[PDB]
């Protein structure tokens, strides 16, 4: 209330939507196995 | 209410109208009172029992075990006026805290 | 439109007891109630809305709830902020108003021409909404106060027309409670009939309980009967005349920005500490960061009241008043006798040590009157009631 290293509101927003718009992962093989396993535990 | 006194402030101003009176006078205001007064009904519900709770209620409230405290109250309410101490013990065994409003 | 205006208003704040002068000018045709005119001041002069960045909005209106059983000029409360606050727009639960607090789009009636006709929330975008009838809202008009309060915006996907148009009022909304009686064995939230949400976004909750007090009865007859006297058609410090005291607020709201630099972080704190200690030490409504902001926000208000533009220790103690009184009207009475006696220290503030005395006189007397009344005081009570020293003073 008196006062009034980090990615401001709009370039967060341009950032997610680039991030969005450009990569979508897929998981690894090791990475199934270990999700499998815990998710099986 | 408040609203209670502005109608009977009307009821005295529609007494004086009736009489053709310029000023509003005490026995208007005496008519519209009674009449308000009439108007408005006593409750009955199936009767004394809530002033000896009230008056209970007070004096633990002026004092703020059972085995004391209720023969304390059993002595306490008696000492103005041999037949009532079972009333007062069947009303306390009725009663038997924080949120309480007299 | 403020030359002489500017000129002299600045000398009323230097009065000194503007603050007090205030609040006896708000409602000159309501007698008593200073609480709530004092909660009406503050709310008319409002806070500082901020957003650090653009990402944590915070509003600065203060918001006002008054629950209370019929019979309390409520609704006089509500028209006299009217009269008096520029763009006051008052509104209703029932369907009898000329504005509503849901937008919609439709020919006009009159006009004849395809209008967006937005709610009274809208209508009031920097200024005042008198809800009237708080607890008697459809469900459409929950919502959209609920959007309102919560947002400061109402969103419209109605025809073609998808917007989003901000409504950034100051809510004052009149209510009754559940079976119009107000109980205080029972808390505020149970008692209001609205829900939990609607009653946070509330900066001030004044409870306006009625009750049968000879002396209080006597006084209210009187102004009413006196006001009826002279207005039949066949014809302690002096209050503001309303204009001047108008102009007062334009002034206010325009130019003084009051500054939180200098506030005493340890004390606040502290105090938020031990309410919320002294919150779940019983069964009660904890305080929540909300009250503090909302502290924060009558301390401005109350620093704009004085022009300081810097809120100085005696407004952060008065906003602190402010909020406590309200939460702990907001308790039931096992827990808001306890929490009263608690933090007495800042209940007290700002008391000269007669009211305190005059109110403990008074609940001895309605105690003793309401012992004869069904059976059918001593200076050692009040003696010791004020120690819980001087009695000369208050005598005279
Ligand atoms: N404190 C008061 N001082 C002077 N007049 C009062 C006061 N309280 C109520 N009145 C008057 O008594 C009547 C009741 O007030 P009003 O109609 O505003 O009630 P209310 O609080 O709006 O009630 P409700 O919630 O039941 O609608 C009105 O004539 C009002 O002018
Ligand atoms: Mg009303």
Same mark, same amino acid.
């Given at each position: 209330?008196?006062?009034?290293?980090?990615?401001?509101?709009?370039?967060?927003?341009?950032?997610?939507?680039?991030?969005?718009?450009?990569?979508?992962?897929?998981?690894?093989?090791?990475?199934?196995?270990?999700?499998?396993?815990?998710?099986?535990? | 209410?408040?609203?209670?006194?502005?109608?009977?402030?009307?009821?005295?101003?529609?007494?004086?109208?009736?009489?053709?009176?310029?000023?509003?006078?005490?026995?208007?205001?005496?008519?519209?009172?009674?009449?308000?007064? &009439?108007?408005?009904?006593?409750?009955?519900?199936?009767?004394?029992?809530?002033?000896?709770?009230?008056?209970?209620?007070?004096?633990?409230?002026?004092?703020? &075990?059972?085995?004391?405290?209720?023969?304390?109250?059993?002595?306490?309410?008696?000492?103005?006026?041999?037949?009532?101490?079972?009333?007062? &013990?069947?009303?306390?065994?009725?009663?038997?805290?924080?949120?309480?409003?007299? | 439109?403020?030359?002489?205006?500017?000129?002299?208003?600045?000398?009323?704040?230097?009065?000194?007891?503007?603050?007090?002068?205030? /609040?006896?000018?708000?409602?000159?045709?309501?007698?008593?109630?200073?609480?709530?005119?004092?909660?009406?001041?503050?709310?008319?002069?409002?806070?500082?809305?901020?957003?650090?960045?653009?990402?944590?909005?915070?509003?600065?209106?203060?918001?006002?709830?008054?629950?209370?059983?019929?019979?309390?000029?409520?609704?006089? /409360?509500?028209?006299?902020?009217?009269?008096?606050?520029?763009?006051?727009?008052?509104?209703?639960?029932?369907?009898?108003?000329?504005?509503?607090?849901?937008?919609?789009?439709?020919?006009?009636?009159?006009?004849?021409?395809?209008?967006?006709?937005?709610?009274?929330?809208?209508?009031?975008?920097?200024?005042?909404?008198?809800?009237?009838? /708080?607890?008697?809202? %459809?469900?459409?008009?929950?919502?959209?106060?609920?959007?309102?309060?919560?947002? #400061?915006?109402?969103?419209?996907?109605?025809?073609?027309?998808?917007?989003?148009?901000?409504?950034?009022?100051?809510?004052?909304?009149?209510?009754?409670?559940?079976?119009?009686?107000?109980?205080?064995?029972?808390?505020?939230?149970? %008692?209001?009939?609205?829900?939990?949400? !609607? !009653?946070?976004?509330?900066?001030?909750?004044?409870?306006?309980?009625?009750?049968?007090?000879?002396? #209080?009865?006597?006084?209210?007859?009187?102004?009413?009967?006196?006001?009826?006297?002279?207005?039949?058609?066949?014809?302690?410090?002096?209050?503001?005349?309303?204009?001047?005291?108008?102009?007062?607020?334009?002034?206010?709201?325009?130019?003084?920005?009051?500054?939180?630099?200098?506030?005493?972080?340890?004390?606040?704190?502290?105090?938020?500490?031990?309410?919320?200690?002294?919150?779940?030490?019983?069964?009660?409504?904890?305080?929540?960061?909300?009250?503090?902001?909302?502290?924060?926000?009558?301390?401005?208000?109350?620093?704009? !009241?004085?022009?300081?533009?810097?809120? !100085?220790?005696?407004?952060?103690?008065?906003?602190?008043?402010?909020?406590?009184?309200?939460?702990?009207?907001? #308790?039931?009475?096992?827990?808001?006798?306890?929490?009263?006696?608690? /933090?007495?220290?800042?209940?007290?503030?700002?008391?000269?040590?007669?009211?305190?005395?005059?109110?403990?006189?008074?609940?001895?007397?309605?105690?003793?009157?309401?012992?004869?009344?069904?059976?059918?005081?001593?200076?050692?009570?009040?003696?010791?009631?004020?120690?819980?020293?001087?009695?000369?003073?208050?005598?005279?």
């Amino acid at each position: 209330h008196v006062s009034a290293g980090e990615i401001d509101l709009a370039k967060l927003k341009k950032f997610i939507a680039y991030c969005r718009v450009k990569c979508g992962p897929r998981l690894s093989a090791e990475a199934a196995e270990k999700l499998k396993n815990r998710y099986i535990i | 209410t408040v609203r209670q006194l502005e109608s009977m402030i009307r009821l005295s101003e529609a007494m004086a109208r009736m009489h053709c009176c310029d000023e509003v006078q005490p026995k208007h205001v005496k008519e519209a009172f009674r009449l308000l007064n &009439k108007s408005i009904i006593r409750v009955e519900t199936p009767y004394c029992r809530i002033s000896n709770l009230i008056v209970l209620h007070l004096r633990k409230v002026e004092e703020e &075990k059972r085995s004391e405290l209720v023969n304390w109250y059993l002595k306490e309410i008696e000492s103005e006026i041999e037949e009532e101490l079972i009333n007062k &013990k069947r009303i306390i065994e009725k009663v038997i805290v924080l949120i309480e409003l007299t | 439109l403020t030359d002489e205006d500017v000129k002299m208003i600045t000398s009323l704040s230097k009065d000194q007891q503007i603050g007090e002068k205030i /609040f006896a000018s708000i409602a000159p045709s309501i007698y008593g109630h200073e609480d709530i005119k004092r909660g009406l001041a503050l709310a008319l002069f409002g806070g500082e809305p901020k957003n650090p960045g653009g990402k944590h909005k915070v509003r600065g209106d203060i918001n006002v709830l008054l629950c209370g059983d019929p019979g309390t000029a409520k609704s006089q /409360f509500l028209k006299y902020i009217e009269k008096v606050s520029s763009r006051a727009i008052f509104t209703t639960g029932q369907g009898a108003s000329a504005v509503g607090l849901t937008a919609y789009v439709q020919r006009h009636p009159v006009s004849r021409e395809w209008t967006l006709e937005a709610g009274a929330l809208v209508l009031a975008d920097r200024g005042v909404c008198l809800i009237d009838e /708080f607890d008697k809202m %459809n469900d459409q008009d929950r919502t959209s106060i609920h959007e309102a309060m919560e947002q #400061q915006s109402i969103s419209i996907s109605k025809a073609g027309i998808v917007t989003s148009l901000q409504a950034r009022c100051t809510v004052i909304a009149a209510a009754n409670p559940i079976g119009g009686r107000y109980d205080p064995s029972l808390t505020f939230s149970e %008692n209001v009939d609205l829900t939990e949400p !609607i !009653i946070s976004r509330f900066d001030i909750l004044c409870v306006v309980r009625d009750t049968v007090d000879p002396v #209080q009865d006597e006084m209210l007859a009187r102004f009413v009967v006196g006001s009826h006297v002279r207005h039949h058609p066949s014809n302690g410090v002096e209050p503001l005349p309303q204009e001047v005291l108008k102009k007062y607020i334009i002034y206010a709201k325009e130019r003084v920005h009051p500054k939180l630099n200098q506030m005493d972080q340890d004390k606040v704190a502290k105090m938020y500490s031990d309410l919320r200690k002294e919150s779940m030490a019983t069964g009660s409504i904890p305080i929540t960061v909300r009250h503090i902001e909302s502290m924060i926000r009558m301390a401005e208000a109350h620093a704009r !009241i004085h022009l300081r533009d810097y809120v !100085i220790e005696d407004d952060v103690n008065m906003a602190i008043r402010v909020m406590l009184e309200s939460f702990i009207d907001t #308790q039931k009475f096992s827990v808001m006798r306890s929490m009263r006696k608690t /933090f007495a220290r800042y209940l007290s503030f700002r008391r000269d040590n007669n009211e305190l005395l005059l109110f403990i006189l008074k609940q001895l007397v309605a105690e003793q009157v309401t012992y004869q009344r069904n059976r059918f005081v001593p200076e050692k009570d009040l003696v010791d009631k004020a120690r819980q020293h001087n009695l000369s003073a208050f005598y005279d």
